[PDB]
């Protein structure tokens, strides 16, 4: 019945938007279960964190079947 | 006596009516 | 059919893994008549070399055994040496790695075409 109780608001979402230069370890998307999928040179960590495996710029392409949003890094 | 009772119901369309509604034919394994 | 759409679903994991790693691929396509072998570059959409059973020097009438796959083994290995490729990955294409798929893989591997 009685009612308080929130939690500490985990700061999720898109870091490193769609034209930005990335280094080879940077967190792309903090994610709660794959909104965005792992593209060309990006990694998919344990808690579905997208991180960069190479350098370049972020792409954010909507590719393929299943309508999936991909974060990929184009070496440019 | 009138106490014994068989219990067979998916045999029971008229013997080989095709399906009952579940559609395939002859013998019993998915082998 | 329900056989073929099942085996493409079986294959799809390794197909989709070899385009992540950027690996040149050695695909097979067994049929009930005979088997095909094909070398595909590291994007999926371009062919480096290709060697079938219906190359016109080994169409025989006994085509489609575990022997014809072993012939296609060196027949694709010596065509891939011309194309300049090692460190290829073997794609069994949802076929079980046991018979003429295994024989084609071993006979291509014997011709220095390194998996």
């Amino acid at each position: 019945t009685r009612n308080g109780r929130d939690s500490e608001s985990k700061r999720l979402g898109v870091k490193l938007f769609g034209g930005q230069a990335v280094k080879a370890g940077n967190i792309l998307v903090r994610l709660r279960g794959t909104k965005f999928h792992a593209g060309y040179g990006v990694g998919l960590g344990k808690d579905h964190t997208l991180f960069a495996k190479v350098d370049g710029v972020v792409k954010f392409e909507t590719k393929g079947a299943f309508g999936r949003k991909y974060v990929s890094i184009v070496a440019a | 006596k009138a106490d014994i009772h068989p219990t067979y119901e998916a045999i029971e369309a008229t013997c080989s009516c095709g399906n009952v509604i579940k559609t395939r034919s002859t013998l019993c394994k998915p082998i | 059919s329900v056989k073929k759409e099942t085996r493409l679903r079986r294959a799809r994991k390794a197909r989709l893994k070899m385009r992540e790693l950027e690996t040149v691929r050695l695909c097979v396509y067994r049929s009930s008549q005979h088997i095909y072998a094909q070398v595909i570059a590291a994007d999926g959409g371009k062919v480096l070399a290709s060697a079938s059973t219906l190359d016109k020097d080994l169409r025989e009438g006994a085509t489609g055994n575990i022997d014809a796959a072993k012939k296609v083994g060196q027949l694709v290995a010596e065509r891939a040496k011309a194309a300049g490729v090692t460190q290829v990955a073997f794609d069994r294409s949802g076929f079980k790695y046991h018979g003429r798929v295994k024989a084609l893989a071993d006979a291509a591997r014997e011709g220095g075409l390194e998996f």
Binding site: - | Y8, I11, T14, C15, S16, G18, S25, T26, L27, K29 | -
Partner: protein
């Protein structure tokens, strides 16, 4: 047996009995399940093996046991997980199975009317009955208390009603 009658009469009877254009849509003969419902006394783990032993030698072939799917706790309990049994005799095994069902072993127990009369569902009816778990070779007066049942229907491996009543008969067999 599915033989001299089949490979020289039945497969050329049905091309001009159903007026089929080419051959192969003449019906083949494939697959069902018994689904012999051993879920009576569901919390057992002791009579399933007797049921498998019952169904083993009357079919000459090993079954598996078929497990429960849901926890439908109104009819019975949900912990009684092994509740089934199952054996196909193949087309290769149908030969000695066809001349053992309704060849000399048609009187299972009794009927007053085994009519081919009262089912118009558009899929190819027949008439025969199986309620006894004893009417088969290699069964005793008493060696184990035999409580079972065996369930066979047949379906078209083919299109429709009248295209599937005709292949299912083989002899003067109502």
């Amino acid at each position: 047996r599915l033989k001299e009658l089949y490979r020289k009469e039945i497969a050329p009877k049905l091309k001009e009995e159903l007026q089929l254009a080419n051959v192969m849509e003449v019906p083949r003969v494939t697959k069902i399940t018994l689904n012999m419902g051993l879920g009576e006394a569901v919390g057992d783990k002791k009579i399933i093996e007797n049921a498998v032993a019952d169904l083993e030698k009357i079919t000459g072939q090993k079954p598996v046991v078929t497990y429960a799917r849901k926890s439908i706790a109104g009819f019975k309990i949900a912990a009684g997980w092994p509740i089934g049994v199952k054996v196909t005799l193949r087309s290769d095994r149908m030969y000695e199975f066809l001349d053992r069902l309704l060849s000399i072993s048609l009187p299972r127990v009794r009927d007053f009317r085994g009519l081919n009369a009262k089912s118009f569902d558009g899929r190819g009816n027949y008439s025969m009955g199986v309620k006894e778990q004893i009417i088969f070779p290699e069964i005793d007066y008493d060696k184990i208390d035999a409580l079972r049942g065996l369930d066979i229907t047949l379906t078209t491996t083919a299109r429709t009603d009248d295209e599937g009543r005709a292949l299912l008969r083989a002899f003067k067999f109502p």
